[PDB]
């Protein structure tokens, strides 16, 4: 199968609502080893969130029933450890597509940012489902990946770039869901916020605002 | 035990984790007791969400098969790819048939069980005919039609016509009329005799079944859609 069809493919899954079929396309298509363009590491990283995002879902769904509670703690638990499971084998399939080919082939800072966000968003996910020793040092790697991509978004791009406003938000996220720090994910996002509204005049900047009216939202959300 | 397997079914529905709850209703099933009116609308919703997002699919890749004129490569692909999800679609409409055939509707002690389920039979049939191939779908519209009908008779004889049971059998044999009959009067006739009927024994409508109502209210939008 050549790259061009297994994006076609992948495209189709997309409308389908098909995402695993879609994650399976696009992870065959950069294990071939070029370089992805932007249409498709979108698409890599659509099914992917997809993917991971329906276990995340069922798991709060089901963690949250596992607290609300006997015997039905036990399936609750077991249940949410079997979604776990699910959810840890797709975090590492993508990170090692991000440590084998993504990020060495990434041959610009817009590319190398992109994926090293991704990097510190799956981390992330593998930390809101992990416990024990093992938390600290997974939090760390996610942490790490987010702060080199941040260092290179503020030095190669402008404050109003979706993908510098999208890392600030994840960033910022990260901060106050899994390292609990309120005051320096509120600081974040003000200040991504701030250097984007101040900068005037975006080219397609619809990406752009949307993130920035993500980024007030939680800064409201967080502020009481 | 059959209490853990029902939990584990809600527990499932919860996440909506729907193929997890189908394959926790169908053990139960097949443990040959009849189902409660819990077990068996978990059982309903269950696979209602497992075929119904291969429906959803394949209507979307049918679609976009149908509007592509020019590349073939493209087309072929669709083509494959609708194939690939008519045989997962096949798969879950034959494990519900043959749960009904073995299970639910020998064992349905009450004429509300045995219309639900042979309406179900209906349903699933009507959906192997949506994706049948030209030969077999002369043959698969006729059992989908005959479990109606059956369905249809036991229900007029008797349950209300406000039931929402016989309310909802009249909106999906409806449907099949118009969307797999091609037979528009048929199934404006049908809608609309079991409105009416509905209208006329306004009285007797139970304080429990909102339901009854909002078919009502879904069986006339058909009317008018269908009439314009
Ligand atoms: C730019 N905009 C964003 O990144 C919006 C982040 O929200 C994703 C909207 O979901 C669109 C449909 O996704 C269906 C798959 N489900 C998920 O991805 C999913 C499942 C459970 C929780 C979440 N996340 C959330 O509810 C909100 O999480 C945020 C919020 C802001 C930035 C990033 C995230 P996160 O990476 O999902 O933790 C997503
Ligand atoms: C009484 N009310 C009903 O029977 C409601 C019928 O509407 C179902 C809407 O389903 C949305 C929630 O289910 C999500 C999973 N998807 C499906 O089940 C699904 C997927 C594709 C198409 C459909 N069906 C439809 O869009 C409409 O079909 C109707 C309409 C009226 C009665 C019965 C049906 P049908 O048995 O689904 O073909 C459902």
New binding site residues.
């Given amino acids: 199968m050549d790259k061009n069809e297994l994006v076609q493919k992948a495209k189709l899954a997309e409308q389908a609502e098909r995402y695993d079929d879609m994650a399976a396309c696009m992870k065959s298509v950069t294990e071939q080893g070029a370089e992805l363009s932007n249409e498709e590491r979108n698409l890599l990283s659509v099914a992917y969130?997809?993917v991971?995002?329906?276990r995340?879902?069922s798991w709060?769904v089901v963690s949250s029933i596992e607290q609300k509670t006997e015997k039905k703690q036990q399936m609750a638990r077991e249940y949410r450890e079997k979604i776990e499971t699910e959810l840890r084998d797709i975090c590492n399939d993508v990170l090692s597509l991000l440590e084998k080919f993504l990020i060495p082939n990434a041959s610009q800072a817009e590319s190398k940012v992109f994926y090293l966000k991704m990097k510190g968003?799956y981390y992330?996910?593998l930390a809101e489902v992990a416990a024990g020793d093992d938390k600290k040092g997974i939090v760390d790697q996610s942490q790490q990946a987010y702060q080199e991509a941040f260092e290179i978004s503020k030095k190669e791009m402008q404050p109003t770039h979706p993908i510098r406003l999208?890392l600030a938000?994840?960033f910022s996220?990260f901060y106050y869901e899994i390292l609990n720090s309120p005051e320096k994910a509120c600081s974040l996002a003000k200040t991504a916020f701030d250097e984007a509204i101040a900068e005037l005049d975006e080219e397609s900047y619809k990406d752009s605002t949307?993130?920035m009216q993500?980024l007030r939202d939680?800064l409201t959300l967080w502020t009481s």
């Fill in positions: 969130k997809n991971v995002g329906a995340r879902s709060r968003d992330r996910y999208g938000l994840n996220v949307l993130i993500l939680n």
